[PDB]
Amino acid sequence: NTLHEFKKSAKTTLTKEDPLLKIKTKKVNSADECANRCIRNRGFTFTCKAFVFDKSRKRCYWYPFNSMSSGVKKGFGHEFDLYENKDYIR
Numbered sequence: 465n466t467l468h469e470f471k472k473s474a475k476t477t478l479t480k481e482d483p484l485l486k487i488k489t490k491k492v493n494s495a496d497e498c499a500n501r502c503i504r505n506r507g508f509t510f511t512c513k514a515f516v517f518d519k520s521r522k523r524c525y526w527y528p529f530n531s532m533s534s535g536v537k538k539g540f541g542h543e544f545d546l547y548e549n550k551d552y553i554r
Contacts, residue, residue: 467499469550470514476546477516477539478527488526492517495545498524502549514548 488508492498495517502512510528517524520543530548531538538546 465496465499467496467547469503470499470547471550471553473531473538473546473548475540475542475544477541477544478514478525478529478531478546479537479539480529480533480535482535489523491521491523493522495524495547498526499547502526502547512549513552514546517545517547519543519545 495515498515498517501507502515505512508526508528512526513528513533514530515524515526529536530552531546532553
């Protein structure tokens, strides 16, 4: 594949307290499709820095931030895998 453009952290989620932030999410078949959409910024208005793939519900979340962003917290979630675009990891 090409998911090799992301740093994977299993059983992890990203949280950021902010009522004025709607997180893009859709049902998908695999993390791979989520990855392609993120690197290409497919139908986003923002720049995707990371995405979480929900293995249980088969869906992903695309974020305009990653774990090193200000105010973003890394959390534990058994069915969630966090993927961070290496271009934004310093």
